[model samples]
Target chain A: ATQMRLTDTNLLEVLNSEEYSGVLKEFREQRYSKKAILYTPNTERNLVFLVKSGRVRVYLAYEDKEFTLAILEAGDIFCTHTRAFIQAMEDTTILYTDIRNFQNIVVEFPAFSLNMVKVLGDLLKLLLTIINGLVFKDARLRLAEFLV
Target chain B: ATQMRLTDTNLLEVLNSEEYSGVLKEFREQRYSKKAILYTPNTERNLVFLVKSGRVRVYLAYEDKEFTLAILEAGDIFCTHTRAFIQAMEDTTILYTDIRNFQNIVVEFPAFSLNMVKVLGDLLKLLLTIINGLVFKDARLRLAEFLVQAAMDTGLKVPQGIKLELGLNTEEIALMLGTTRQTVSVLLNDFKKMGILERVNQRTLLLKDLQKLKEFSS
Candidate 1:
């Protein structure tokens, strides 16, 4: 959902060569001001977004309690399935591909599709670090680890 | 390993549709007794194993105590090299396929590769639940949820609540819940006093009140 300073791999990764630039060019870049809600729950829009610059916060809420899932900075891909809320934490830039375009790219670049799994798997592994921190380490230790 | 009750989902789901019988035929099936240790720190084993019968407990050790990571039962496959130890909890049978076979299969099958991401993502979510329990809940609440979860592991009807027939003792449960054995004992005793749990035998427990435990669940 957000940043962890792991390997600098994006949605395209090593396959971002010129051959696929035409496919990549289809994604539309959009901008929004601070505190803008990108997508609300139960909306008809189904799209995948890649953060270009600035920050976005992902969270879940019920009544008064709001739990922040992660903070997405540049290079993070977010495909919220209406399970979480996405909002621009500051003035932000994003490159978005709707479901149809995303599927077209997957068909156009099968290698890119393979790369997607590796990227998602890496993200899942990163989640281990966060849960491991809460399970075994204290807040002070986690903050120190986060800084280091 | 060959026929498990779980869905053919996860990293190996594609194998279910393909000519993978021969591929799985290459794995070695081995059995171990209770308290049998299969892997330890720096064991140098590069293979993936699926629990076929009984359970395998994976955990990390700090000089004095063990921290239980997970207890994988039948159909569960695991491959890790995290300076942890894997031991048989009971008389268990496991099927293991070497790392080369593992890699070759994943590379040969694209559908299987996609399944890996989905499986890993699902595992991450399950960890989130466990972490939530450890973080936001008190010791009693944590223990209570652990009981409900452990009971629900078999997916059997718990109309009268479930009885744990497995050999997981108090210490392992304590480690899994990130608490001390004494604390687990006190909490279990407290639950028993509250008529929420029934002490059957040495290795058994009747989850007397499922709804009460569910209330503490995330």
Candidate 2:
């Protein structure tokens, strides 16, 4: 059982060589400002990303409102769901990898397995918190913290 | 890879036959009645529960207030962060399996992996609904939905209608509905006037007109 930093509970650490080397690098490197749109709904894409620097704020735009989903920092993963408005909260650099390659290897590597599950689990948990907050807190409270 | 029926899908229908059999053999079965507490903020358990029948409502409790997170029915899975209260909404059965076993299967079975990911996606969508309803819609809509769902989850069908079998008082329901007791009373009375509801008992109500209640939920 390989225990990379992904599975070792230090999520902020950089990926080891084996894991890092697997990422696709065709795009090389890219940067965007504090307000940049990384992805949008109904658009087609087949890659997942790892944040190299800066922050990304994810949210959904429904009818007339924007509901903030999450903010990711360095070393974080994105595109857990195939939809969302991924915006740069600060100037950013991100590494991209094909999701198909990502999926095939997860089962073969314990570190990847643990990391993927943990990342997905963390996301699901945050969604639950958002649901909980809306119900119990009069729904008016975090319409406040949500706009950022 | 497997296409089970849509809308009302049986989650296990996509699992390998042997894997499904293995789960049924190993999962510890637990049952509870309405108001029975399955977990609280500090419950030191790491098992995922699959609802077999009836309903499980997850909510948060503080001082004297409650906020319902979700009301899940049969075939739904509850493996949340465990900072909330999970209670049975009626007579309920759940199959509990260890987290490690759950993760192992997720790796081994492609069918299971795809299905589990779908389940997680659906769960996320439902969470969005709950949040959006509260933040965007009027309290009236959520109130109507909570009552209709409570009946659907815990209600028993009869010649007259479906009878709500919940142990929740209107006040507690008001809490879950993100409204006030007075608001709950006013709406319940309005439903009675519209022939959509009948008070079966203090804690139970009958959906005498399911069509009308369905309209309200919409």
Candidate 3:
């Protein structure tokens, strides 16, 4: 696996348009080796990280038992939550942005706030669609839907 | 049951404080009687409605058979999607907000857009919770958890037990549980036999043993 530095232009294209340039400029680059655990539960800080390269897994653990909630690949954005971890499944390069700075940017940039809402809306709709499938659709049908 | 008109103030309270005054004023009030049908299949509209008073049910239909997917009450909002609303079971008041207006509001008010994200986040969390429950918890545990949550959320306490105003039929419960009506009936009967639940009305559920229910769920 290789690590690549994410430039402002690349971040702009991945995030949205040129509107997020101000916010994107604050992000710092970080590299992790494969099979590295980036975060664990009960951590104090809340940093939002965007995957610039390689793969990361978001998972939950109760004592020793672990459950994979999602796998984040290139362009996937995640934050430190109360009960999950961000682990590098492959040698990963990520852009780390502080939550406080992100919040400040949201307050400063109206377009950024709107864009974030749209992204979150799409994600929520996707999650609900998955949940609906899990509840109402048969497992095979869900697997097919997931594959499609 | 009586029908009441919903005002912009109520809508504002349901939404974020920043959105309360801006976009909520654009909504129109609609009132419906008990057992009223809000929307049906093949409806060609995408307008979403917010429940201002009473409750509304969203369900699915297959070959003339209907299945309840959700029972939404005041503060709960739904769209005018054909597959969304199966029927309305009580005197309900709703604020019909057009999608165009909603879009305009979101475009104009950044706070409104942010609040929408927050609402969607809540919806996502709820969906995940339900999925986790289905995957990790058994049927009996699910039933017990449902009862406990209903009591905590919307139950009216009586002398016998905590009465749940679920405002849904057995068939609807079956649909929500992803089971047949007969199976739900059997489960309900078994709960009754076990002295954990009692039927007050066709739509009402009374919990006789909350501790026992918790233990059973555990």
Candidate 4:
């Protein structure tokens, strides 16, 4: 495990926490120019990433159309696993770690495992709530749910 | 915890194992007849149920119309919390325990907590997969996925075929897919014509072309 200095103070605070420290050390920083495509659909990679500066958009393509899934900003983490497809919206600096190494750290560190479980569980629950909203609730309601 | 007659001998065997015994008790039997509503939407209940016999259908009602979510069966447990709306497809029996009591049991037995974490994790993963299907997969694909999951939940295994002991009527299936009953009937008929499914015993459904269904799903 090694520490790398981050230029963004807010990013430093989120990445330096004890809950994230084990996985954080594996993050390899990369700077991208404006409007870079970080990933595309139907491709597989076992890495997760976090944005340290600038913004990013995560979208999915179906046929000729694309639907926006999320807009991630500084302090937002991305690509926790191979399932999510992500891309950048602007000139961005990201911190990323390979999923295999992250899993190894989770196995070795109990606190890291607990934090991962909590965060992943929260993500799953939120995703379910979103799907349920899509099924039973209208677009306005879903938008409202997203807001609050 | 008490011992009750284990129905569905396969699931019974799984529960009787040493690893599962410490976490689960056979307990008293509870039964729900056909069309009986086990739970309603937005109602709070402290108990979670483990299916011991027959099948349970999950659905939601909106504007006097019903949509089916999923069908749960023996070896399947649901209502872990107070959120989902559920019902019985036929005369079904289940073993149930209050969440608070289960928590107390977990405190006394750490193995129970571990088992629970595993079970909840599986449920979480399944829910995510279902969400992905809903978002990315088409409705026809969604129906195929639903059928596949229902078959697995019922513990039916065939080397060359997939079968489901469907207790739901066409209306209920329509509710599950967020479509009209007419549409469900038409879709099933189309699948039947294409040899994807074969009707049996008026209600039971047998998948004749699992590979074809998989192709449709993808």
Candidate 5:
């Protein structure tokens, strides 16, 4: 409530820039059928990628109960090393690279690093706001918070 | 639980590093007296800071009741514009810079940026833990979780039970649990009737069997 919401569109700007065009060529693009498992916490080979199109569900399961941690849509940058299970909810395409190349990409582009900072901060704010709603459990209070 | 607890010690590493000496000159070090209000959600300036020494309380209030969000101590990196009230719980020292300078600092120091990311991520995980307790759990179970956590933190061991002085009224407990006062009151009474809990006084409680309480939490 004290801080203004951060806009993470700058990462998209960096990803689409002319300078990043060459870096994109070294990256691989893969397609997944609906309900395909992209990665699990136990899997081998860590990958850093961006969702090119469609959606993926990031969730946790214990016994029979499932709790969805997040839903990643197109243009979202993510990594497979995240402990949650990730599965495509639709026919999805993702641009990917290994962590080694991704680290080099970050070092090569300062704007990318800055944008990533903003992205993480934005997600932090989003989660905090959501937690507030859960804690209060009052629709009017949540609405007032959202409206402002 | 997938990620190892992110030690935000990296922020302190950057703060004490020789390379960050130049940037520290632009930051201001301020001392706050005990119980002094540092900043509120209604305040103007946005700040990014590190707790240099002592302790501070980050909390929220509704009318007369207060809910403490966190108690930050030495080497803790935090900010003022987080929509919570920040007050010095002890004589505290904090090194701070406005958001504008903080952005430039992040751009200049890559380590600081990465550490801040970890710091923010850790907070998100903590909140997610609280959310998990609130959702997909009954009120009794939620109360059990709170009692267990409180017992683990500071419950004094006695002959027959564990003594808990939560220093919170039923209304405040209800606020933290996202439940109504009457519900919390009834639950406390039910616990007392079940022989799992004993009321030592209005302000004190005794958990007769910590083992039995854990059974309800699961």
Candidate 6:
């Protein structure tokens, strides 16, 4: 029952390792202005990315309302998808490439695939916990859950 | 993006393939009678399973109310954990194994890992949609959406409009919308007064104006 606690520094270490750094060296970098729209459900710019610096917000919006899905900082990994909108919350730097390019990296590192699975699984668990609280607990309990 | 439709037969084909069949053969099979609860949050039986036959309901319940997460037919893959309850809606049979056993199985099969990722992603997307509806939409709008879904799924075509024989009671409908039984009753009366709906009987409702009902939901 081993658990992977992939903090920002730990993940950055993994990416910069000898097995990965060379292959990832050719990734393109771009800077965004504060509040820039990085991607949206209406857009087809599906790319795997790494946040090199600053912060970003992933959210879902209906006609006039919006809900925050995630907040990403340095060393975060994400992909553009036709499900949620991603925006640069501050002046941000990102390294990005196509999914196929990333898939090749994953193929070269079998053990790392479990890392991706764990990351996604943990996210699913977090969201479920949030929803559980929303359904059963009051606002005070929700705030307490968030704090610890 | 490439899509995986993953119909019952298609999923069954994948599991029965030469790649997976051997490892999955060790799974234990169990049968449940109708309305039998297979798993719940209070229990720690963390096992993964495939619905070999019959139907099951995945739902969340709190203090006498419940919300259905999904209805699983044959060939559906699921796990028994604390997140939700799995109950046999009909007489059902399932092949199951431990979570760690399934984890090792996925490790040796990268292709299956990707499929599992996609399955979880789809479930996450569905939950987000449900959350969005609950967060922003009113009870009236949410109830309207349910009726519209019912119309599409089980309604009968009639000259007046669409006939809905909803087997669900007011309490159940209230649970689905995360509202109250009294609230649901009042809304149905409101719809009837608006001339868009008519109550045929206790379980049957007639949409006198499907267009209007759809508009209300939207």
Which digits, one per residue and each the tens of the lDDT, describe model 5 over residues A73-99?
A: 876666765445789999999889886
**Can you write out model 3's per-residue Cα lDDT over B102-196, one digit (the tens) per residue?**
65665466555455544444444444445555555555665667777666666677899888766567776766665677877788889999999
Which candidate has the highest TM-score of all? 6
Stretches of candidate 3 off by over 4 Å are A1-113, A128-148, B1-22, B28-45, B60-67, B80-87, B91-93, B97-100, B107-111, B155-161, B193-195
Report lDDT per candidate: 0.65, 0.66, 0.63, 0.60, 0.71, 0.71
Positional deviation of residue B95's Cα in model 2 after best superposition, in angstroms? 1.9
TM-score of 3: 0.65
lDDT of 5: 0.71
Per-residue CA lDDT of model 6 for B1-218, tens digit only, reads 00111222345667777777777676888999999998887776778888888877777887765776666667777777647888887899998899767766665766555556455555656566566666667889877877776687667899988998765568656766677789999999999999888888777899888788899887
Interface CA RMSD of each prediction in angstroms: 4.4, 3.9, 3.9, 5.0, 3.4, 2.8
Q: DockQ of each candidate's interface versus the true one?
A: 0.21, 0.24, 0.24, 0.14, 0.27, 0.27
Model 1 interface RMSD, one decimal: 4.4
What does candidate 4's lDDT look like per residue over A2-39, in tens digits? 35422113544746876667557787888877778777
Q: Which prediction has more favorable TM-score, 3 or 6?
A: 6
TM-score for all models, in order of appearance: 0.66, 0.64, 0.65, 0.59, 0.65, 0.70
Give the CAPRI class of candidate 4.
incorrect
Chain A TM-score relative to the true structure, per candidate: 0.70, 0.72, 0.68, 0.63, 0.74, 0.74
Model 5 over residues B104-213: C-alpha lDDT tens digits? 77767666665665555456555555556655677788788788877876688999799988655786567566677899899999988888898776667899988888
| Deviation (Å) of B207 in candidate 1 | 3.2
C-alpha displacement of B163 in model 6, angstroms? Answer: 9.5
Give per-residue CA lDDT, model 4, range B1-218, as digits (tens): 00011123234555666666655663546899988988776666666577888877765565665555556668766654434567787789988787545534544544333444344444544554555555666567767776765665562556547776665577666665655678777777889999888776555788888778777776
**How close to the true structure is residue A120 of candidate 2, measured as C-alpha lDDT?**
62
Off by over 4 Å in 1: A1-10, A14-117, A120-127, A130-148, B1-18, B25-36, B40-47, B91-101, B107-111, B151-155, B162-166, B216-218
TM-score of chain B of each: 0.77, 0.66, 0.71, 0.69, 0.65, 0.70
